[PDB]
Design a protein around this ligand. Sequence first.
Ligand SMILES: [Zn+2]
Length: 218
Amino acid sequence: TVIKNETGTISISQLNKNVWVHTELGSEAVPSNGLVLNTSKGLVLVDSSWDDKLTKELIEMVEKKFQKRVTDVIITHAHADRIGGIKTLKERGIKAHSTALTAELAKKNGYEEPLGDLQTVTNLKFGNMKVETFYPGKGHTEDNIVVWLPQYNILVGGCLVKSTSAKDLGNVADAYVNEWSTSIENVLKRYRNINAVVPGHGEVGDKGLLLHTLDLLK
Ligand SMILES: [Zn+2]
């Protein structure tokens, strides 16, 4: 099931019972994927959106939809599509989780600072919903992390993972192209039984998306 806005810029699609994928188009419309986790104690998002207007609109949508508060957001890296709505998060009392490095880079890029609480391996539980954040090393950016939902074996790769039709790695000015391969290998070694994989943008797939990205990096 999918739910969008009248303009069509914001869409939310259900993966399973309590897991949805939020997608926003940043204008040439450029999409960005994130997750919406419906828990017994509120809504949790994996990544915000391009800017504050889109992020606020996204939050307004899911809150109206599930009739609950978005309590936390996990930021996967310090770029606009991930941390663009940080000001909106902070003004609404939404906890913006991130690694210390992501917080450092957010500041450098002119964004308000996220919590910087996430360690290399951080397990978070919101109600019955379990979430694991993992820093696999440098790739798309120096700070990129992945998110794992152990109850569903769902992997949110962020921009470290490209979609099936993607033949372009995207912006590599802040990337560590050579190390990117080792980082993907660390994700593969850590999670031996992956089901669905959500790329930074594009359609949800499986472990084959990680192999595809390694192919592009060759
Ligand atoms: Zn980026």
